[PDB]
Amino acid sequence: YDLANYVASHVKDPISRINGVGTVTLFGSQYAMRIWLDPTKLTNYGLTPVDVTSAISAQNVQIAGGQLGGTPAVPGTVLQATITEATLLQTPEQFGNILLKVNQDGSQVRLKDVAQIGLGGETYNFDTKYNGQPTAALGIQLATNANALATAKAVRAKIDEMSAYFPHGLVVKYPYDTTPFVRLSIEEVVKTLLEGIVLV
Amino acid sequence: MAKFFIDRPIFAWVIAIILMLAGVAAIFTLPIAQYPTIAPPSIQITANYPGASAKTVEDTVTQVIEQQMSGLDNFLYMSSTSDDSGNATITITFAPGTNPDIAQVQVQNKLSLATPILPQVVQQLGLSVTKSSSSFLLVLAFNSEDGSMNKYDLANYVASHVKDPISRINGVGTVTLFGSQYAMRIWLDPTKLTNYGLTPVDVTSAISAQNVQIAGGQLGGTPAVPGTVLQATITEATLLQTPEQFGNILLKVNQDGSQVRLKDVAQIGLGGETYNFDTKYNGQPTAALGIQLATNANALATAKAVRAKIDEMSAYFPHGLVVKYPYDTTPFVRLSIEEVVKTLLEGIVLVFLVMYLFLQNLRATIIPTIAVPVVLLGTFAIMSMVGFSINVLSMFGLVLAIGLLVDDAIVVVENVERVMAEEGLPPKEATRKAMGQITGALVGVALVLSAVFVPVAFSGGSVGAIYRQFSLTIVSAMVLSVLVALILTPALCATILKPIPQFGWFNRTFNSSRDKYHVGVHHVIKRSGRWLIIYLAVIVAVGLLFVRLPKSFLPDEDQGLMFVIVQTPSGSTQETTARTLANISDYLLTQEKDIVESAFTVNGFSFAGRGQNSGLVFVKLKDYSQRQSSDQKVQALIGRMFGRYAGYKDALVIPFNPPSIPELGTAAGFDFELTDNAGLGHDALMAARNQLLGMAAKDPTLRGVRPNGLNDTPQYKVDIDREKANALGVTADAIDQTFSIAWASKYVNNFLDTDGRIKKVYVQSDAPFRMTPEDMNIWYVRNGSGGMVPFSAFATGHWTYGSPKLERYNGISAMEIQGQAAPGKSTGQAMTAMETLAKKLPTGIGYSWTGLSFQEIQSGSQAPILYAISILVVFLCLAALYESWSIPFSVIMVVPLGVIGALLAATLRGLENDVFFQVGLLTTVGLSAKNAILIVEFARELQQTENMGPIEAALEAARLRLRPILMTSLAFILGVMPLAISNGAGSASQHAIGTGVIGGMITATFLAIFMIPMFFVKVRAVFS
Amino acid sequence: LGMAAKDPTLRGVRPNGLNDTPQYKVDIDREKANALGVTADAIDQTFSIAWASKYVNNFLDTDGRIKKVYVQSDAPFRMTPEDMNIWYVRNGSGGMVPFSAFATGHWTYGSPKLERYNGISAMEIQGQAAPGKSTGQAMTAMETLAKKLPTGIGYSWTGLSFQEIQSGSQAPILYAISILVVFLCLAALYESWSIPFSVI
Amino acid sequence: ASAKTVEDTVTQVIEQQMSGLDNFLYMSSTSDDSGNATITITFAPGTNPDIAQVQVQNKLSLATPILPQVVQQLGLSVTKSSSSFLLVLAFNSEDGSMNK
Amino acid sequence: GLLFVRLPKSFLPDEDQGLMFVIVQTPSGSTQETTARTLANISDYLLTQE
Amino acid sequence: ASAKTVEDTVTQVIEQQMSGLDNFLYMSSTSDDSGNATITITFAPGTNPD
Ligand SMILES: CCCCCCCCCCCO[C@@H]1O[C@H](CO)[C@@H](O[C@H]2O[C@H](CO)[C@@H](O)[C@H](O)[C@H]2O)[C@H](O)[C@H]1O
Ligand SMILES: CCCCCCCCCCCO[C@@H]1O[C@H](CO)[C@@H](O[C@H]2O[C@H](CO)[C@@H](O)[C@H](O)[C@H]2O)[C@H](O)[C@H]1O
Ligand SMILES: CCCCCCCCCCCO[C@@H]1O[C@H](CO)[C@@H](O[C@H]2O[C@H](CO)[C@@H](O)[C@H](O)[C@H]2O)[C@H](O)[C@H]1O
């Protein structure tokens, strides 16, 4: 999940913007805030999953606050500043404290009490290995009528640029790449051309 | 070719006629614009999130759109901001050459795919995709002189009556209304809400429910029962239209039967969609309308047409309404066109007078005066075919090009006259003999000069965009001129000129002079080594003058405008900043009453974004003819404004003359993007910004290094104790929505105004209840069991810091730093200094180059490579001409001659090494190469047909070429002289070109006539 | 149109638009409805679903093709104004109140479609040249009749008519340019100003 | 929307944004009591219709923040039009086994 | 000169393509049943008398 | 969602609108239990991808 997240958060979007890159596939994703419900615990508090989805949507929010002294203000107002009310939650701990119920004895039920919260994948569809070790994979598909050698060289350059900010231990390999083949075959026919010149 | 058309003047005149006709057609169909497009296409998306903070916009709007912006062909980079006016702006920049239509549609389609993810309010308000431009044809100010209309009335009027007719004027491109218009404003009163137990969401929902347009189907609709004999569309429910109807919306009914209505709980009425800004004309309310020119229309007719339609429909403006034109560039382009036509006609008269002076033969003078107009008209015809426009850059191209095409005309006719007189032959044989001595050299001249000019045409970037219209107009004219010298003018000479049968002081003085010159040519030859040391002295002077002469793109003209940036201290309001702007307008209209025509003020805007603490003043000056003197020019007004407002505590006031082409910025400038590459956060990035800026302000390689955006500013946080509220039975949604509607306002739905137009509906608290943090406690929200709870029950607030403007580059948070290279230092070395500073920043902070520094990085080793190609092909063309690997050196060495003169003239007049200087220098170096090419050509032909030695050949060829060289230089210096001594609009550019070329022609021709034969004999001695 | 009916030059002149049609407005007395316990939304939605129909969602037909689901009143109940009485809406207490209790009918007349040509309100007319007349002669007759219309009513030609005007008015200029070009071509070919003239 | 509502709030707005179109010849538009707006932009003969379409769409972006929210959300459709009613197929059930 | 100016002008001739249109427009407010009946009138004439 | 849900609620909905395309060559769609609808439309060679 960490490798898929790093790639999603630092490599994929800029690579997706290189000319000639038609499309980009991450077998993985950026982190997703993951809320794993427990039905027996939901039953205990008289709650359903919809209660949970609704509370996330009401308590995980960014709210327009307008302004102190904002416009149109009463004549004479001489101070203004933006108001911040509610913000997106950020860590699984904050989500675990979302409020679900006020039960009879005065306690309030919270999402931590009905679910496991953590960062994981948007999808659990994939599993990738490079030489049997964990990997995060980016499939680069060439845009229609774009030049494979040009695009591959540009993306390899952008990756070389981004390598300056890799976390410790992060390595990049190129498991599948057809442009070395095309480049080497053009190179080889050039070599035969010059051999034939000498022979003539 | 030449000998072909000599024997047949009819065919040559048919070709001349076709060129002339096509040229006239191009005169009347070519586009007119002040400048060609320069900068690469950029597409910007804008979004509005009413009441959202910069952080809210970055997280709910900007980041979503950016994450969706991919698969765009030819993307160079992307740059976005998110600010406290609730505004998102994302600009995508594409590579030079990209089709702007395709970039825009590609951007719009990715944006359409992105739209569902965005906040519902952002979606409902609509996003904009537009091509980023910095230029306008006209900007109209619709003003209420008697106060009958405020800015909302004015903008409403424009949108209802002007924008549509104006859009249908031929040649009008984009039409922008700077101005907000009517909206139904519901101003909630919290106490009246609490008394009836209502919340702002009740109001929004009632509006959503009662201001509706309902499809009624139709009577007798299909499928119908048999026998029905009438259809009719049925209308049920229509949008509310008037404040009374909105106030009569039913909100609640009490048990006693009484009804609670919106009028009982809020103030309802027409207001503006936004109050973020205010615009004033000369202290009057105003609404502005920007008219941008359609692609490939002519600016002059479009502007005349717009002013004519505005005049036409001003017959029906309500009382008190007037239209002013605070912005208009078109007088100045009309003036450039008049000035160029004046120069071209003068150039024709000058060739007439010079041919007569040296030849005193009317018949021979008329040939160049036919040939030059034909080539100019053909140049217009070629410009039409190639897609150029009539613009200041191309017009200066024609101005510089007469020096080449009159030189061709004089070479042809003067050489025919010399052969016809000194050798005594009749016209057909004389022209055949004279055009057999120059045809190959003329072909070679065309190729060599084209080579001279290709490093300019093939230059990349916006600077190359400046160059190429200019240089390629020169190249078109030159190539046609060579064709005309080989097609029309030999036939004109062979048919027009007659034999010569049987002032005088001037003839005697020129003959004495050319004898002293001939002896001087010999002197320099015999003293070669001394004058080769002198040649190296000239080269060293070229270097030192070049390094000392300031860099520049275009000279800054007084175009009758001045822009004033106004930045008041943080937290300032619209009311407070309005008074710095009001001060400035009153000052301009009273103290500068005789200099200033308009002062247009907008607060709410800098050039770099919005803010209540920021404004602009747009001031137009009086007609250039009523503005004589040095005190009355814009530069002096900028000085007086620095004086008045540098000692001004309330605001930062920057007066400045707008640059001609703003996209170029400053030649010494650099544009840097400091980026958060490790997800380290805003605080870390600004810590790095401040660290880097502190280093740069100590750096002698750098000057003026400033952070392009804003420092963090204090903000007020509302903390809701959600569990305390829930214990009270109050749900988080009720709290946040009540607070947000009251403070940030809310867009509910559309309504149909009494004029039949669709407008927006907003509910927000009335201003008295949302001004202060205390007001946050006067607001109520209901709990799950009914009844009202105050915000004071569960809400506290506290002050903090946050950015009011959040910048992103290529999708990751950034902060743009902008500066200049230190005087005497280059931009590349400035970039290296910045980079070594950036290396010394904490790990995870990266950076990118943007703008003209990015352009410089992309094309780095292009300039030297193009020069090598140019030099090589010049050399190869000359080897073919001379059949020698060494003789071309006697021509190529002419280059620094004349360059020294241009540098000398510019430095002694304080002008700068700008683009005008550079193109002028290229044409004069081209002419010196041509003069050297013909000197060496005749020296060669004499050395091989009359078996002469190198010195005899050099001396005789110098005698032969002295007259035509002097004829051309005299005509050309006199032709550009009026530009080099100019009063009035555009004189800075006219000076920038004229000073340089006069200096160049002077030293070029004198040093060339004395040193080129010495070089010829020297190369002949050295490699033979 | 009345003028064209008598102009012997032309036949079949008809408007390409639509005459004003009778229209029926339904006025809801929202105060009565609020007093009787129905919200404006309920009456709005019932009358639209009943008369205008509603596309609710898709269904999957027996052939495997996705198609639409529509809800509307059966024809006998939505045919005449007199029908609008039978529709009931249930109020906030669960009781039913009929439309006749709070709504009124109103006849009027109005346009079924508005035309704009280059932004100017307009009405399109098409016609034929009478047997024995050309398209151009019919257009001259049309301009003669339009000349006799009230001041402020102008006209334009579009489509075939516009292209016809281009053809007819450009031909003489093209003949002139063609004569000039033949003149210059023979002047060049035969090195004479007298040969091309004697030919022209 | 009524015919007048459509014309004044949809059709006119869309037309206003159509300044600056390369090779514009004229434009004609309809606004019906069915709520329908149809604006047909005709260009010079020989104009590239694909370029014309991309330009019309790029100009249409300007209209969306002015258009009624519902119209802007529901979507505007842009197409290369024709009246070349080329051929019409009539499908008939001769044995009567199928109706309209 | 006079023979050119006198000559009636046109764009293209009306060729018989083997096809013809008949446009029918009934009073405003009329129903699908009413227009179906006029279209049938035209179809009956064309398919019996013509 | 299942491949069948994907086909009924997305793939058939999009396909029913893929008409009026210049240089249409063929179309190939797939709906799978990973919730993915992929509709590839191929045009004649030389069709402008833009
Ligand atoms: C209604 C009032 C009368 C009409 C107003 C006239 C409007 C059109 C005139 C030119 C507008 O062109 C606009 O000018 C300003 C100053 O050159 C440029 O601004 C430039 O310099 C300023 C400060 O030097 C920086 O804030 C900014 O990074 C840079 O873009 C801006 O990039 C260009 O977009
Ligand atoms: C006579 C017939 C000649 C053919 C027609 C062309 C006319 C003028 C010739 C100019 C050759 O074109 C010129 O090529 C050079 C070398 O690639 C380019 O330079 C580019 O490539 C080199 C490496 O490939 C880089 O080092 C350099 O930073 C980059 O800008 C330059 O931007 C372009 O302008
Ligand atoms: C391959 C290259 C190397 C070989 C160089 C050969 C020439 C060098 C001769 C001396 C140079 O300096 C000077 O040359 C010129 C040549 O006109 C002569 O003087 C004179 O000669 C001719 C007479 O025909 C006069 O017309 C001319 O005004 C005058 O210069 C003289 O002989 C010598 O005083």
Please give the oligomerization state of what you see. Answer: part of a larger assembly
Strand order of the largest sheet of chain A: 1-10
Bound molecules: undecyl-maltoside
- What is the CATH superfamily classification of the domain at 33-121 in chain A? Multidrug efflux transporter AcrB TolC docking domain, DN and DC subdomains
What would you say the CATH architecture of the domain at 33-121 in chain A is?
A: 2-Layer Sandwich
How much helix, percentage-wise, in residues of chain A?
25-40%
Reported by name, the CATH topology of the domain at 33-121 in chain A is Multidrug efflux transporter AcrB TolC docking domain, DN and DC subdomains
* Spatial extent as radius of gyration of chain A: 27 Å
Beta strand count of chain A: 10
Largest sheet of chain A: 2 strands, antiparallel
Sheet-strand content of chain A, in percent, reads 15-25%
Task: Assign the structural class of chain A, choosing from mainly alpha, mainly beta, alpha/beta, alpha+beta, or little secondary structure.
Answer: alpha+beta
Q: Could you say which overall geometry of chain A the principal axes of the C-alpha atoms support?
A: elongated
Q: Give, in order, the helices and strands of chain A.
A: HHEEHHEEHEEEEEEHH
**Total helix count of chain A?**
7
Cα distance spanning the termini of chain A: 60 Å
CATH class of the domain at 33-121 in chain A, named: Alpha Beta
- Largest interface, with Cβ-Cβ < 8 Å? A-B, 49 and 75 residues
Protein name (chain E): Efflux pump membrane transporter
Family (chain E): Belongs to the resistance-nodulation-cell division (RND) (TC 2.A.6) family.
Subcellular location (chain E): Cell inner membrane
Organism (chain E): Burkholderia pseudomallei (strain K96243)
